[PDB]
Symmetry: D2
């Protein structure tokens, strides 16, 4: 059970040899699940089923839609979320994330229609213009795109990709205009994304349009921002600046999607609250055979720094049209969890696909299977050897509680936290047991989904005047949540982390107590 | 640096991940074998030439469909395309032929709680070949059609057999008896496709020459969320036993219709190589899809990238600690050669072998450097593709009357092959493995020599 | 350069060795217990006071010699010296008293009617061994009497017989016993005889041991070192003899012969701790094999969490000289590196000329060796080899030790009644000292058997409010640590308490700033 | 149940300790070298024959006392004893001669209870200059301590003595060693790399093949150890003087540090002084002394040394035999699984094919449990490169160079064998002849038998520097 026989192996190779398909996993699923909301999932009715299937974060993509449309999406999520608040013991917080548009390049309209398409045949000629006279009159001869300075960055012989890198063009002759030949062709539609691998796209990291959406998210009380195409640390500083004082508590997740962002990852990770490995654009900007290097590198460096990392894009792509995934997609999710990803994401599988609930359920089943097969003995040993010595009492308390949880096979680590930080410090050491973080801050409970293993619970009872009684109140609530979810039963042992006084920064007490 | 050598010198696996560098270029050699299913999209002589140039090592023919005259024509075109490069033996690549049996599949014969899936797992319990997740084995291991197909393979001189739906050791022995004495040198690769094969894997592996993780049927017979567990389990035990293991099915499925893979497909190929798979396989991507060459090229590029990212310092240590002591001189010589190749950053290990066994025992310990196996046996050269890192070369030169001179001829042939393929150049250091007398079984000599 | 912390952070043991630095000073705290045999050279109140100040934790009484009156006076002098520091509880050091039994010894008679006469034995010469009581006081270079009446039943021709702690060796030539001297030398009175490889059938607990153990219960000793333990049933016999009145006395089994090493696992299971008694052991087995048996027993005791003592000839040359040999400096250091909880002195303190110097040398070596321990490897291995458990105290103990490495704490403070909670911390071998606060004087004395436990005896009365009684004992430990230089105000320490009074309820670990 | 094989398979160091067995007998091969100081107790030819039969590999000559004529007769007696066994080349053991220099010494019975002039208890004479504490007579008296002071040595710890690296007497003694054809020099009180160079310069062209072992005996040599190690052929941990110059409770740190860095560099390290000191007067050692010898071997020392135990004491043969018995037990107790892995990890990757042949040979020897590794070598270098990786099996180094066979004793596990056959015309036949010679030596001394598997290292042409061939070969 829980691959515990493989966990006691002395080598990683023998650990693999002991992986048993008949060793059922524990109940808790530690990996967070982010879901992109769109036409197939934005109804209050479907959203309620997204939550029951395991969605923790509803993602809103501001590459498309108006502020009024997204405001309605946010309302439906919160409506579906609060529809379960009648039972505070089974209530699951749900976070809202805003994915900025960023320096996107998009084509124009095919023959004045949003749905029209033309067939590009390989080897044929195709002209690219910036003259807005063709902005709505693109066809197989001429194509308009919205990057005015595309000629200052594209040398002759360059390659241009259109529509998620499916169409590829080679610039055969530069103009004032661009004369290209189609390498790989096919159906060319309207408003398609363009990638220029190996070109210094001078488009601003934070456009005037992005400024409005960021301030929109601050007004809407979003829990986090996914910032697209972050190339350097100063790009992160603009995002932090625009969010200003009122958006101080909004977590900033930098998306790495090009060569420069990979090269500058350290300065970007230092300034950010988290990372997203956005493999979609990344797979086009750099060779597709190198993406897995960038992913393992970014996940490991984030695990080392104790900052959240998200694995995103095309994880269960085939499930947009089919109710079951391919074998490659099953192993991709599992290996991302084995790599150490805090969260796994879904895009078109939930935004527009035909089986959005099956996708969420499949991600939940695989992640719980992958979490049991993790070789904890080596991971915990390596995280401690790579983590520096600390003078923070909470840090020493966190590593001691994780070590104690491996020793007594505890059902959970219960943590009282106001800002989340205490639970974050436990999570970075990757215990096997789920981390039940008890909080009264709703925003804290929603941002805890970015961390592996943190199962946030929001206590709704009023603050008791006697502080030692307020602590016991929240601890017993955690015991009720854990017993109701089947994390443990009466008589089991659990780790409880508390402070010596109210307020953030005083977590310093670890207790080993039986389940009431 | 190159070949992820900065990540290679890390003291922990986590720090090894942190040092992976997309700007660190891999070496020229690609160690993982590429098995391509040949079908209507790829059975022309002109196409097969491009597939070989793209890196195809093994042509798989799926006997679930097609007549013997059809398959015999496919085999013939495969050998025409293969032998079209024989005029230059420095650059000639052996290409193997594999026969994949139909096996005991239920289609919509019969002699049949709940649970019963149909049409590749498209109905049960509802939904839009037939599988019985967790059921008895009514049909025989080797039916009468399989016997004729297996006998046809011996006649067409195939190098290996992929036996479908192996459930126990006696299934393997049944196949072996059918190949008989005329096909006793044909390698039997047991395909693990159901819960029974996973439960009885150790007895199946012991009876087999190798294993295929056939994830297609496996993902229907057992929960889909468990396939990664059984895959890593079987690759691990095959690595421990030193037997070849193939990862198969839906690795680049979307490339049937599209010229570039998804992100999940790109990481699936890489992680299979990182797991330790000797070979990776393409099915519909090469048999029926619109982009057969691109799929072969993509497996080549990913595999070479992932091989540079292997954490050899942990893998080599753990492979030795788990391997038993030996009295076989070839086994001791082989592990000494691999240790020496790491010590001097060798450009290759050159192995002279008649049956391939000497090269197989080197591949067992997973050197970073390519293993140039020099043989005069054509079947040995073709069967070498089943093993990670073995780059076979077929020596066509006549035997020299002085045995020491004949050894030097074959060694110098491997040197010219290595130079022409960019594995190494003049002045580099290589490991050379030979014996003290002619004949198989006497490999016991390791020499550390500069490339002339 | 401090605490060999540069060597502490190595990735291999070889690199750890390469980084050991003679210019990197150790900390104040010395973790290895020091046991001293008290004798003529050291039994005065004046000398005992200086030995306590020099670092002695345990006074060993060797009941192979002396009367009950003699030992009663020694014990009185030990307690006089100890309690002379009892007026400052912050600085008072508990001192344990250990009784070392005679056990099934074999001794010779008197040389020419004198307990101080001595003859000379020559190589190849013949020596007659008799059991006739007419010679028990009439021994000389021709006839030797010994008190083992069954010796002819257990020896044969060619057997080796060793006399006076292995100095002289004989070989039986005829069966009274006719022998030929192999190695000669001066033969005194009442010397010990070893019969290596013979099946000696003496009782585990003799009538003399019965009287000495009863004396031990009346005199309130803290532990018994039981000589020549051969099997678990020997340990049980000692436990039954001590009975109800001696149930709290710790029983340390001395492993000194071949059967003891062979049956070590069952003996360890029955005992509270182990002494590697290398003196007799090096005569009973080949001396080139002693180091193997020592490292085996220390390893298995560390694995089981039970105290192990390394004993005998650690600083033998300091009996006559003020400074040890290089081999002796190495032996003490390697015993601490092996994992020994305590190191022992015998003749160096019982009868030598430099008893204070010997105690001070062991203190200096042990503290240097403790800094050199490769804690990264040791802590990882003790955890891997320890089973998962449902005991909250064990999980709390391993979390506290892990926390102490994380924040480089100056100490782990533990409140314990019986000692058990501190013993469970010591089993995981933290670098930081373990300050065990107890109100039980016997718990305080017995804690010296465990590496790193620094016991302090709280004298303050019990507070009615239990949370105040707890805070009182924690602050007392804070004052002890500051007064002894383990830490200072602003540092971080680990505190271990329980949720309710009484033994067995330790479940609370706190990371606390030093006020 | 043999050679601590059960403990050898443990997955942790702790479990390795827990599995050590006193009932697990070692092999016959003893890998650690034994160096004996020759003096009035061991000077006679008949005594030296027994010391050789008991395990002495190197005879040490202490040039702090005695005359050139005295030491010359000592050398003649050693060579007389050594060559008395030469009638059988199969069983002959080479014996090396080492010269130990006096070096920068400061020397002076009355009583003293708690006035230096540069012979009574009121004014003492010393031969030195200016410059705190001063130690006299093996550090027993401190200046403050007391004792029976009676031409005793003086130590000035921490200080910087103005005495030259080599003295006029040492120059004469070094030139004497050159004339007497000694195999190695133990250079006393080496403080810096320049001191090693001045010694190497004194030995000149005629003494260029003489191995220089630097003795580390004070604080400065410990701090400048890396530069001294690089310039030297090897290191001696001279714990006698070192234990006076630095606090005695720190000697074990310096010893373990210097053995580790020598093992890491692949250079010989000798642990010396007071290892069996009580055996000067007693036929058996103390428990601390048996532990000290064994822990020196477990630390990784290539050689162990006897001083007064063989030079002046009553039981020299017993002392040599005890070091032999302890060393053999401790070598079986080595945790090879960890040691070999760590040695490889800290060793650099190079292009020298001899080094790559050496690791591959050691790895192969662990895989097939070989009875030996046979190395053909003319300078010793190829055998030294095998020994740095510490195989469990013995290294039979077959040479025709008699100085090489004697110098090989400085390296753990190298069993030197001197071939005296004429050089055969065919190269391949001259190699086969020397290999077969090692097979016979192995069978004679019980290292292996017919049908066993051994590792054989050879090269591709005559002369030194060409070892590149490893073979796994059945014993004939
Ligand atoms: O993780 P954070 O943000 O530091 O908060 C943890 C805090 O929660 C507590 O357990 C309770 O604090 P509050 O009563 O103010 O909510 C404190 O003891 C502790 O300092
Ligand atoms: O791997 P195999 O089949 O054992 O072959 C190894 C043999 O090949 C050899 O190169 C000799 O082969 P040949 O008999 O063709 O000359 C020897 O080195 C060795 O004994
Ligand atoms: O180590 P022991 O013998 O279990 O004693 C530890 C006990 O001491 C306590 O801290 C309290 O001690 P008191 O009973 O003297 O107040 C308990 O919480 C705990 O169970
Ligand atoms: O260890 P060294 O000094 O390099 O000598 C090893 C030499 O021994 C040999 O095996 C034999 O050389 P020789 O003919 O000089 O004895 C050479 O191949 C090799 O170069
Ligand atoms: O047969 C296969 O290859 C499969 O089912 O995966
Ligand atoms: K006694
Ligand atoms: Mg993008
Ligand atoms: Mg000296």
């Amino acid at each position: 059970t829980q691959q515990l026989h493989a966990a006691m192996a002395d080598t990683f190779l023998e650990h693999m040899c002991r992986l048993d398909i008949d060793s059922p996993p524990i109940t808790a699923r530690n990996t967070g699940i982010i879901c992109t909301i769109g036409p197939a999932s934005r109804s209050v009715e479907t959203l309620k089923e997204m939550i029951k299937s395991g969605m923790n974060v509803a993602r809103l993509n501001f590459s498309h839609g108006t502020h009024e449309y997204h405001a309605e999406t946010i309302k439906n999520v919160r409506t579906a979320t609060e529809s379960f608040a009648s039972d505070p013991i089974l209530y699951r917080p749900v976070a809202v994330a805003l994915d900025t548009k960023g320096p996107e390049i998009r084509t124009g309209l095919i023959k004045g229609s949003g749905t029209a398409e033309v067939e590009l045949k390989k080897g044929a000629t195709l002209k690219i213009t910036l003259d807005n006279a063709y902005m709505e009159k693109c066809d197989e001869n001429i194509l308009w795109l919205d990057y005015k300075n595309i000629c200052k960055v594209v040398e002759v012989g360059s390659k241009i990709y259109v529509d998620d890198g499916l169409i590829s063009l080679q610039v055969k002759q530069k103009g004032a205009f661009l004369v290209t030949e189609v390498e790989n062709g096919g159906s060319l539609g309207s408003k398609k994304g363009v990638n220029l691998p190996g070109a210094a796209v001078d488009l601003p990291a934070v456009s005037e349009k992005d400024i409005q959406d960021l301030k929109f998210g601050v007004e809407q009380d979003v829990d986090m921002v996914f910032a697209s195409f972050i190339r350097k640390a100063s790009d992160v500083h603009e995002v932090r600046k625009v969010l200003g004082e009122k958006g101080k508590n909004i977590k900033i997740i930098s998306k790495i999607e090009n060569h420069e962002g990979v090269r500058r990852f350290d300065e970007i990770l230092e300034a950010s609250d988290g990372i997203m490995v956005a493999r979609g654009d990344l797979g086009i900007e750099i060779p597709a055979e190198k993406v897995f290097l960038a992913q393992k590198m970014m996940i490991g460096r984030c695990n080392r720094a104790g900052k959240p990392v998200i694995c995103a894009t095309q994880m269960l792509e085939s499930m947009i049209k089919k109710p079951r995934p391919t074998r490659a997609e099953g192993s991709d999710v599992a290996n991302a969890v084995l790599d150490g990803a805090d969260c796994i994401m879904l895009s078109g599988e939930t935004a527009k696909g035909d089986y959005p609930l099956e996708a969420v359920r499949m991600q939940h089943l695989i992640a719980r299977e992958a979490e049991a097969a993790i070789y904890h003995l080596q991971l915990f040993e390596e995280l401690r050897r790579l983590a520096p010595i600390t003078s923070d009492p909470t840090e020493a308390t966190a590593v001691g509680a994780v070590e104690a949880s491996f020793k007594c096979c505890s059902g959970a680590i219960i943590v009282l936290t106001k800002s989340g930080r205490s639970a974050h410090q436990v999570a970075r050491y990757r215990p096997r047991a789920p981390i039940i973080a008890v909080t009264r801050n709703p925003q804290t409970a929603r941002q805890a989904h970015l961390y592996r293993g943190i199962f946030p619970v929001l206590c709704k009872d009023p603050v008791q005047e006697a502080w030692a009684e307020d602590v016991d109140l929240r601890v017993n609530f955690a015991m009720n949540v854990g017993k109701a979810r089947g994390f443990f039963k009466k008589g089991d042992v659990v780790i409880v982390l508390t402070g010596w006084r109210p307020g953030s920064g005083f977590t310093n007490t670890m207790r080993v107590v039986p389940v009431p």
